[PDB]
Curated annotation (Swiss-Prot):
This is von Willebrand factor. The lineage of its organism: Eukaryota, Metazoa, Chordata, Craniata, Vertebrata. Changing C8F: In VWD2; subtype 2A. Residues 13-189 form the VWFA domain. The chain holds residues 1265 to 1465 of 2813 of the full protein. Disulfide bonds join C8-C194. It comes from the Eukaryota.
Length: 201
DNA sequence: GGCGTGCAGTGCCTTCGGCCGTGCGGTGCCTCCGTCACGCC
């Protein structure tokens, strides 16, 4: 059914990772942010509840929002909309999974919660950059960080998606036809993510 | 005069050290094809 009254109130560290390659257009990237913010207003943001991070990843990653930013939610969504279209020739899934592993989850800020890397991808990084890919995926598995591949478009690295799935059982993936189908699964996605978090005592 | 190796990594272990390995860009499924500088014999 369609979600009518949804407001994820659980203990969750949620990280948004946005493919910055030219595989997506300006507007197609604008829709991606639409999907993001639309999902943000469905979450209880608080340092004691649902924390969120936002990262655009090209050949290198720019973090618009950190988990500990401790700003106001109404602006956290503001930032997410002002995310610039990079259209780079390279969106390194390895590098960003690296960044997430060593930068975001270097320390465990809150053991009691669940961590989720929402990998919104639509491209294939150069093959030579995939060297230590599994390494990063597994490194996250050990730090108890779920990874959720979102396959947008015909160029979404199918191999890496399945490769990620294999690593961890709770590494379910969503394979979409385009940025269009993104909205059509807002409920099913947001639900899965939220329902994977522990509701506080 | 052909070869056969190259080397990333907050790598790894027995570390004042050595070994495992996508040498490298770039295409478009994939972990690879098709390349080029280097030494060595």
């Amino acid at each position: 059914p369609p979600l009518h009254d949804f407001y994820c109130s659980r203990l969750l560290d949620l990280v948004f990772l946005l493919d910055g390659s030219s595989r997506l257009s300006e507007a197609e990237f604008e829709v991606l942010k639409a999907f993001v913010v639309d999902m943000m207003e469905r979450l209880r943001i608080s340092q004691k509840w649902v924390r969120v991070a936002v990262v655009e990843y090209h050949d290198g990653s720019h973090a618009y929002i950190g988990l500990k930013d401790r700003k106001r939610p109404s602006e956290l969504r503001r930032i997410a909309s002002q995310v610039k279209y990079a259209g780079s020739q390279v969106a390194s899934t390895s590098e960003v999974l690296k960044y997430t592993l060593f930068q975001i989850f270097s320390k465990i800020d809150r053991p009691e919660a669940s961590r989720i890397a929402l990998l919104l991808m639509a491209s294939q990084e150069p093959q030579r950059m995939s060297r230590n890919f599994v390494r990063y995926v597994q490194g996250l598995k050990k730090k108890k960080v779920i990874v959720i591949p979102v396959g947008i478009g015909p160029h979404a690295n199918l191999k890496q998606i399945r490769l990620i799935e294999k690593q961890a059982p709770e590494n379910k993936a969503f394979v979409l036809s385009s940025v269009d189908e993104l909205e059509q699964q807002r409920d099913e996605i947001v639900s899965y993510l939220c329902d994977l978090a522990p509701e506080a005592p």
